Structure formats: structure tokens, C-alpha cells
Amino acid sequence: KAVLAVRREDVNAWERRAPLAPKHIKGITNLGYKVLIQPSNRRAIHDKDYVKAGGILQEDISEACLILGVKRPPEEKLMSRKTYAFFSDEILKQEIRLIDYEKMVDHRGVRVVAFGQWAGVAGMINILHGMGLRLLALGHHTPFMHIGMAHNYRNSSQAVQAVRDAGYEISLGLMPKSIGPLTFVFTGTGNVSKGAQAIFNELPCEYVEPHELKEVSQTGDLRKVYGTVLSRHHHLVRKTDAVYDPAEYDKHPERYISRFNTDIAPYTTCLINGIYWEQNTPRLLTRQDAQSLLAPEGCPALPHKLVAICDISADTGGSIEFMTECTTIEHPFCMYDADQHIIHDSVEGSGILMCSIDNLPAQLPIEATECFGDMLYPYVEEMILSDATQPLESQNFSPVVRDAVITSN
């Protein structure tokens, strides 16, 4: 008797995802609920697949009490006496219940509704493409020229075949010698970091311990790429006695510094940053660290070892002090040059190539939709039996859903 609707995305041309996939609509209709799908040429999964799974294609979504979307409408489009959920008072004036997927957390306070590894997958394809263009601008044709942007591929499978194909060229010795071994450092603990690792694993890779990076950055095999996973214990020490205690760094991070600038950064070609930075944590790199890193025929050496930094988390303006500006899917790369200036939509001149896109998952919209839908599915029935007309206190919500309401009730 209660009716669910999936709204069309209207916010931005790049929003090709949805909060639920066909298989989720097949599940919800098998529980006897009616599900309206608002027609959309924008969605990367076609309307006829939502219809095949028992959804009814219809512009008018007035009858629905739960409306699921990805991004909040401009507020002009919000029907009254209904519950909306998005990835986000004025509207509180009315009887409108708003839910924020980002605030849906377990008893420990860890998120339970997200895009999983998919930001890392897209970020790693993006930065490999970026390094192709950056190294050509410095005068080096490489096999990284043969990897496009994440959104130029049908799905992660087609992307993986292009990464393996460029990997074969590297493994056959088609890199230029003069630029030396290539080193990749991965930071952070989450699913997003595993995604970037999963793309790297398709190249002719070799994982080393952080202390080895000094050696392999000089004498590594030029038919391979080198990776290292960086953990807290590798680079964080107390200001007093240069010791690491994990229980103490959790409570009082202010007693700690990072040795990343002296121990790892000078031996790094590409930093993939997956850290979630906090207001009292040590930084990986400062503005002064950048000055020192930059200060240094047809076959030149690199101007300096560090070519690129890709941010795959939220943390835009955190661990790397000078990475202040976000990039976009359309303009993915900017340069931090030797005069401490950001040059937008460019891979030319001096300095460090940087990539910081806020909606990386949208570049792989089908797999992003499947993954998100899987995490949301168990909570959908609670949300369908939500009543915007009644008080919050009387709703049969789990703490997960209750705590994620961002309206007065």
C-alpha cells in the first residue's frame, strides 16, 4: 500500500548513478511494494532494466511517501508531507523529513552506506592517465599514454584490460631509461585504498617495505613498477623520544610528528592519499616540504622524483597542506609550481601534478550504483514505512536511520 519512488537526477550532467540497481527493485517488488521509476536518459543503467525488474516507468511520483535520490534537489522541487533521502530550518517550515546517507553509522560510529572501493578504482585510472600526459609534457612518451580517464571505459573490466595492456608494454622494456624506477605509495586503511591497489596489481608490480623505497627508487628493474603500503607505525613518532604508541596517538595526536617528508617523500614518484585527516593530526607534507622537494638532451632525468599526488578520500586540504583546491571530472589535473601557485586544468611547466575529485564514483556509475544499493537495501523497508505526518519518536526506526534524520523531526 506504501509506494517507493527513485527520482531523476537534475543537479549536474555527470550524475549518472542512482541509489538502487534493478536487482534491488526486484527484491522490493517481491515484498509486494509498488516502485515508481522517474524516466531518465541521464542514468548509466537504462530505464528498460528497472522495468524488467518490476518497476513502473512514470513521470508523476505524487503517490510516493519515500523518494530516494543521490543529490538533494534545489528545494523548489520538494513535494510536502513526504520523506526524501540524499547524499547531502528552511524546508523544516513544512512536514518534510530529510535523511542523509552519509550520517548512517553503526554503534561504533563507522559508515554503513557508501560507494566502497569505487573512488579508489577511478582515482588510480585517472592518475595513471595524468602521469601519461605529465611525462609527455616533460618530453617522455610512455605506455601511460594508452590509459584514458575512468569515464572513457564501459566498466572496471574494460579499464583493467587497458591497464594490463599498458603493463605488457612496460614489461617488454618500452619505458625510457633516463627517468628511472617508478615508485607508488598508498596511505589510509579503508575500502577506497584497496580499490587503487586492485588497479595497480594489474601492472607488472612489486610491493616493498617502506624502508626499501630508498634502495629501489635508485636500482629498481625498469620493466616493473614498485608499490608500498604506508601504516601509522611507519612514519608517526613522539616529539619527545621519537617512539610510536598506537593507543596514545588515537587519544593525543598533538604529541606526534610525521617523518614522511624525510623518510619516504624523496623516494616517491606518485602519492595515492587515502587518509581521513583530523584537526589535530600531523600533516604528511607542508608548504616548506614542497619548496625543498622542488628546489632540485632527448633523454633527460626528471626535474625531481615526485611527479604526482592523487587524493582518493574526502580530505581535500588536509594531509597535504598545499593541496587546497579540488579538481573536477571535466578538468581533472592542476599544477603546484615552484612559485607556490596552483595552475588549473594543466600538466605543463614546473612542479607537482595534483588530482582531487569529490565525485570519483560517478566515473564508474553502474558498479557504484550496485555497491551503494547493496549497502542501502537492508534499511529500505524501514524508510518506506516512514510517516512525515507523525512525530519522529513513534517511528519504528533503527538507530542507523533515526540518527541520519537532519530535520527537526
Add this chain to the structure above:
Amino acid sequence: AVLAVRREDVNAWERRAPLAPKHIKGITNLGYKVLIQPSNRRAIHDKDYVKAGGILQEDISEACLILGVKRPPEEKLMSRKTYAFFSEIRLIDYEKMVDHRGVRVVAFGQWAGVAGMINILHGMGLRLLALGHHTPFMHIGMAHNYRNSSQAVQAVRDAGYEISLGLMPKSIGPLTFVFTGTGNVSKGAQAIFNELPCEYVEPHELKEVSQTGDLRKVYGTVLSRHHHLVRKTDAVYDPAEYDKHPERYISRFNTDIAPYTTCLINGIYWEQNTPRLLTRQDAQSLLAGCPALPHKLVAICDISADTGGSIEFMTECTTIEHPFCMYDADQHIIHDSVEGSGILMCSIDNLPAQLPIEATECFGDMLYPYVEEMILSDATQPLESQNFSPVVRDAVI
């Protein structure tokens, strides 16, 4: 006695060379010594030129013939030597090398068309998304994102399968592609289109299929002079007369074909007194959750390098880095963009450089037969006594 291939220094995108490894194997088997200047820029690695009998060496002083792609900086030209490029020092221009009929003999063949067709299919992906339509054209990148034409063809076939499975949005209607010109360059664009689920029709049919075509296919037509050119007086076509006096003719392309066209691939070589395909006034008239297109014509790709003054309003060239611009409803050109109102346009001058290995092989094949003449050139003696063919003699500038 000694031949040299110089490193390209002009532009970061110049990844081609005048000869491929197999050509160096041929020249060394004639007993000539060949120096190759080392280059991380070249898309074919130094080790392959060495494997074929070339010697890798920075100092190129002992060579009497120096082959390159683009003409060096004037400060870099050594005295008493012969240089060949694409424009007491003897200079040869590959572009001026023509046979007794006056047709070019040293060029990049079909490869501009191949790159141009991949570029515009990518362009249409971005343009149609900006108008609110996810399509399988989103899954084709720029020509330079692929290792060679084979990897590009697999991505075009893959997107073709999505179209053939019915994954186009219906509201956008049938997609029509018109090919103009007679050259190799036009065959290249056709060769990429043939890898989609295509169907070729006669020009008169375009009116019908632009309204009732199967949305699981893409439609193509090849446009000849006889289809659209008529005399001002009696609306008749005589091919012998259009050759001599093109000023007596107009084009019916604006009224007969343009209104039923999604994508114009333009390969015409325009002359100062030929009729235009489209004028500024034609453009004004053409521009006038599941929407129709604002108008039928989405995109124009020039594959002859702004050698088609055929489109009056296509004034400014695009680049590999910034491939697309928009001609909007107010007659304004917006650079490096697929957003807002109007027509998407692509006009890149060095399309072959996006497929640098195949471009090098093709060019090298056309040049190979004339290399021996050029090696036995002497810059110190007069031109009249050189044992040159008319092809090479006429190309000295």
C-alpha cells in the same frame, strides 16, 4: 655517404618520425650508415631503430642528409648539408613532392581520418551527456588514449555492441553520418564507422531514415559532387564544366542534406571560387527527463586540416589538448567546450600525430623509394647537375 634521423624538438605532441625501423633495415642493407639521434619523445623506442642496424648517437655532424618531420629552429640548421621536413643550406619540402599528374607522393594516407573519426565519436559522447543523454559513445576516448588503431577498433566494436543491444535513449532519434571528399583521409573515417552497427544509404534516403531509422543502428551516406552541386541558371550538373568554371555552381547541401544530418565528417579540399557547403545564414536557420535534440545537427569534424573553407563559420582550428569548440546561437565560438547551445566543431591540424606509430610506418613507406637520391645529394654543387627525379628536384625550396 651518411644519413641521420634528427630528434623532434618543435612541440610535445610530435611523437612521429620520417622513417620506421623496417626502413632503416632496408637502407643499411644497401650498405649506407644511418645515425639515429636519441629521443624519449618518439612513440617507437630507440632500441627498435638499433635492432634494425641504426647507430644511436647525439653528434650528427658527419651526416650530409638530415631527415626530420618539422623544420628545426633556424639557429639549429648546420651549413653545407641537405635537410628534408614538412614546412648554402639545401632544404626539401615533402609537401611539394608530386608526380607527373601533380598528386602528392609523400603523405600520412588514411591516418588523419582514422584519428578524426575516433575524436568526434568521443566528442558526441560528451556533447550528448551535456544535453542530458548517457550514450555508449561515453565509452570511446581520444585517439591518443589507445596504443594503436587495433585497440581503438576494439573500443568502437564494444560501444557498437551496446548500441546493437538497444542502450541508446529513444528520444534522441536516429543518428546520421555524412562523409564528403575523395581522398585516403575520408576512407580512414569510413573504416572506423564500419566497425559500428552501420547501414549505408543514398543521399536522397537520408530524409526518410533520419525520422524512421532503427535505433539499434547508425546510418551513413557518401556525398559526391553530382549529389548536391547544380548550375545557378538551369540547376544541372556537368562535371567537366564544374572543374573549369566552379563559379557557375551553387550547393543544395543546406536544404537537401544538412537538415537530416547528425554528424558531418568533412574531407573536401576547398578552393577560392568553389561553392560552400554551409554559410553563416544556413547556421542561423539550422539553430532556430527524455527530451528530443534541440536541432538535428550535433557535430562537424574537419579531417582535411582547415582545407575545407566549405563551412564558413568554422574559422578557428582546435588542438589535440583542446579538441572541441561550440558555435552557439549568437554566432560566438566558445573554445575547449561542449556546453550551451549550437554546433560542436573539431578541426585539428596534426591528427596523424595521435596515431604516431602507424603514421610513421605509412609516411616512411611513401618516402622510402626517394631516400637514396637524397643521400647522394651534394649541397656544395649546383642543383642542375644533381641526379634527382622531377619529384625531388621540384620539392627543393
